[PDB]
Symmetry: C3
């Protein structure tokens, strides 16, 4: 389903067999945990069971005061990408929860059922859920024991039952403290698989997005956030910021670039060219979304998950950069220099190899050994036969993803540019920029020749 | 308390309502944990309690030898920032602890009280503390049981008591192994809240810094380090590198830049300008501290915490860059190019929006929907009315921090520069650099015209 | 054993007392854990022990289904470095394990002994091991209890024995879920010290590499990967990708660069020069390996561990850049600008200090206070006397590593270049590039003077 074409003219390759899943929104859900006020009780004794229960209660109290310590702390966590607050919706919902009666309203609403829809003070309604019931255990089967009337423990079963109806509050508090209240990815302790699926079921997305997020809950967790919101009264509420995917089943292709120099035998004076448009290109609505940072975009089988916050808006004519560089519809972006370095780029369905100078290049195999030797120039081999490629000192491994590969032979575009008037200081210039500079220099030389 | 002013001339905004807290030093404290030499004992049996105790002792021995495994391992963890060793003081204190009799001296000093001041071998005195007492349990209430004379366990209370007077050694050892001996931020297991506050109380800082670090212990942990130092004899010592704040209650302002191009209708030939001085500007003593990396600086309410290691020293005249770009006192830094891209910058008290070409721009609201439409040019709206802003394909969320915003209307400085002789290759140039280049080109053309 | 020489001509320093350990391959080993199919059993009761056992079994089932959730998820995790898949070998071994009968073959092979060599379906034989035996406990001492015939628990010893013959499956599953199936560094829970040493013993490396990796198992863990491979039948297999070091005991030196400007008293017109070749330089076979990213290379005492994937191949003549910049054998790389900034670089055996303009510079000591004051110009002091250095607003700490330092006095190379025709826009140019630009400008001026 994944097809790859390599263009020898620009030493770039694309993979147009991918399906898109772009995050175009945020969904906030409040998760509450009921707590108990046992700090007043101070049951103590020389008995081993009493000491163990006291230590467990001390750990619980430490966790509670350490969560309360985060209450007075605001939560917060290529060059043209810009900046943005990814957790802004979560902190807004937290601030809306910070008002006086919202805790009382959430308790009154959740006092009947586990999951309910609550209208907040700002007019925005968010789904609310209760995951843990610690009060129902402490105040009913532990509070009489901790009370000073008895201050005695019958058996170790009680302390183990407490540890197990706990340990989860402990891990949640530890994660909140380590991640300063903003934790990503959301762990299973913070939101288990069943509760996550239930929350996805009641989200107002459509059936296709529901199925997609149910089949990629790991990516959902990786693209989610959990922010500490309130610790007041006898409840603990933290907001989960689930992603919203509004772009479903649309074409996307990843573009890989490798530097292409000239084949001059001299050590110097070897001009070079490289394309500065690496990343994913997703189409959503009459335009192409550019994702320069490949780390923010995750690939699951044939489906790619990308974040629109770290994205750039480009016109639909950017696709012509792959077929015709000198097309007038769009201005392709290139980088110019003459550092004759040797390097190779590993692709999903192959490996672009371009070693220059006195650097060897071997495409080895796990059984037949070396099967291909590269000369001076851009080259590309599909992963059907070659398992790993070696460039000089390095030993790169080629991904063994199944698919089809295509080779588009063409004359390199660096052979059409005169090295005498070739600028080698461009960092983020374009084809039009380089053409204008070359024309300026050539016309300068022409007018000098005419004046002489 | 936070005020923001936006300048239309340079498409930059500042927020001068912040208070500074700069780290200008390091404080090292040694924390010791007593251990026991049970490796000689090999009590075993078919009883379930004996097997459980043996497994717990095996886990303890594994933790001990895994900490001893780190003994023979040295600990170690915009372009003009430079390099530096953040844990150099900690490794120096560790090396000073590595001498022969320092372990014996620390044991003799801490044998009486929990916290004491110890003069080291290098003449530097550091506060020392003992957080765990595992020897007092193992050698007094467990050693007779583990001894081969009995090799029998009366009840499961003993194994649970051991697990709980432990599990903390376990987590500490796991964190040390995961983080290669240098862990940051310091977890509550490594230094609890009470011990951290006690250590802050005896630090020789003044009352203001004491109160500030007591109210921001989360930031203190985030800016602290814990380095494994020694595992010898029957003690385990690791050094905690707490930050020292020598700059308290001084003005600081964060500056945000957005690219500003021309409003030409052509697809190309659209010159642009951007300021390359993003980051925080803190004044400490007759100078401004520049922090290009915003990740290293953390904001807590109206107080900002910054690290002087990743800082640059700038004269006090750098403030004039906000009011008068062409002031002769200081040379403002700008970036020149003509890639007409569309992007927006989210600010603390608003959002700077600058979309260019055929890219739409809407400032939506959670209740009234779209409330503002942006034309071609730099613009800025305060977060009082707009909740989220959308640029083309993206959907950015505006922070809802309370404050005041100001708009300073002015003619853009790109309208005063001729695009014909405008350089578009500058990456880290300045106003003087661009003026010199433009003057050179203009004088070149002038002298050609005079020669013809 | 570590010697450092500082060159005043280029304001760069080297440390040639290091020994190399380069990773030139990957070793994959399959680790299997036996599981049991208890999901059919649904023993329940009002007894406290029954409830505790049911909760433990529910936690085990949640861990199992959460590991099964990762089954349908492919695992995946200066400008001339290129890209590459570090876990490609691991995912290839996982795909080879994905075939039909490979699980049955691995079970049949491991049914007799703990560690055995297994020929895979692709013809590549990998060492296989079994670390946990959970089936031998559950199906023999727990299954009769969980069976509906009794559904009763005699004592809490059973549940504690289960928790302890577990908790490790729990931590492994939690780490796999947090790290999306690809975890690095490999924790001790995933591969303990004894099993790691045993695996190193049977690896086909030579004795020298065996000893080196046995003495640096922390670095081995830091440079290793653990990838979820299969969860089928009643076994759980995850592949460990250990590093292979094929370059042993070869010279390596780290090069540090600091900007060096002119000593002009004017605020502007102060040209500067900086070398853009920071990083480690390791020799392996007739060539020098360049590692621009210092984060990927770790230093252990006098031995440096580097990754060849993030490396560049350079000729052996690159060593001449340290002694003779203008040597014709190799073209040294420099950066040109005139931003007169003040900064210092902390070195292993000293600190290169270069502050320019009105910025103070003090080299303080822990006992004698300030011992040295720097004038305008590049300077370097060995860590023998100075403990910490201060540049303007900053307070940098100097590493106290023992060694020898050398000072090579020389005239700065910026004094040989005319500032009038000095280009100040070069980002990654070379000495030849700057010389060509200067010669072009000078010849242009010459021919103008001759024409006038």
């Amino acid at each position: 389903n994944i097809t790859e074409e390599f263009y020898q003219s620009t030493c770039s390759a694309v993979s147009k067999g991918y399906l898109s899943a772009l995050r175009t929104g945020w969904y906030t859900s409040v998760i509450t945990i009921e707590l108990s006020n046992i700090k007043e009780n101070k049951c103590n004794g020389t008995d081993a069971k009493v000491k163990l229960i006291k230590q467990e209660l001390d750990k619980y109290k430490n966790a509670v005061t350490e969560l309360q310590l985060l209450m007075q702390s605001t939560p917060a966590t290529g060059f043209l990408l810009g900046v943005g607050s990814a957790i802004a919706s979560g902190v807004a919902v937290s601030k809306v929860l910070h008002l006086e009666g919202e805790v009382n309203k959430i308790k009154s609403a959740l006092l009947s059922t586990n999951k309910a829809v609550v209208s907040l003070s700002n007019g925005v309604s968010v789904l609310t859920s209760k995951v843990l019931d610690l009060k129902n255990y402490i105040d009913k089967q532990l509070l009489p024991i901790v009370n000073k009337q008895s201050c005695s423990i019958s058996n170790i079963e009680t302390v183990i039952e407490f540890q197990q109806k706990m340990n989860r509050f402990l891990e949640i508090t530890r994660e909140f403290s380590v991640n300063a209240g903003v934790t990503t990815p959301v762990s299973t302790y913070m939101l288990t698989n069943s509760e996550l699926l239930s929350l996805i079921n009641d989200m107002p997305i459509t059936n296709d997005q529901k199925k997609l997020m149910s089949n990629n809950v790991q990516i959902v967790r990786q693209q989610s956030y959990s922010i500490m919101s309130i610790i007041k009264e006898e409840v603990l509420a933290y907001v989960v910021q689930l992603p919203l995917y509004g772009v479903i089943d649309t074409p996307c292709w990843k573009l890989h670039t490798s530097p292409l120099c000239t084949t001059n035998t001299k050590e110097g004076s070897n001009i070079c060219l490289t394309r500065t448009d690496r990343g994913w290109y997703c189409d959503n609505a009459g335009s192409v979304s550019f994702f320069p940072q490949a780390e923010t975009c995750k690939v699951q089988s044939n489906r790619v998950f990308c974040d629109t916050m770290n994205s750039l808006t480009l016109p639909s004519e950017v696709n012509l950069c792959n077929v015709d560089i000198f097309n007038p519809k769009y201005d392709c972006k290139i980088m110019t220099s003459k550092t004759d370095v040797s390097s190779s780029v590993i692709t999903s369905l192959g490996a672009i190899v371009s070693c220059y100078g006195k650097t060897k290049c071997t495409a080895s195999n796990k059984n037949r050994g070396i099967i291909k030797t590269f000369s001076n120039g851009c080259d590309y081999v599909s992963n059907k036969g070659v398992d790993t490629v070696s460039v000089g000192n390095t030993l790169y491994y080629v991904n063994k993803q199944e698919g089809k590969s295509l080779y588009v032979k063409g004359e390199p575009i660096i052979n059409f540019y005169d090295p005498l008037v070739f600028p080698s200081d461009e960092f983020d210039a374009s084809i039009s920029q380089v053409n204008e500079k070359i024309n300026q220099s050539l016309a300068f030389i022409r007018k000098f020749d005419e004046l002489l």
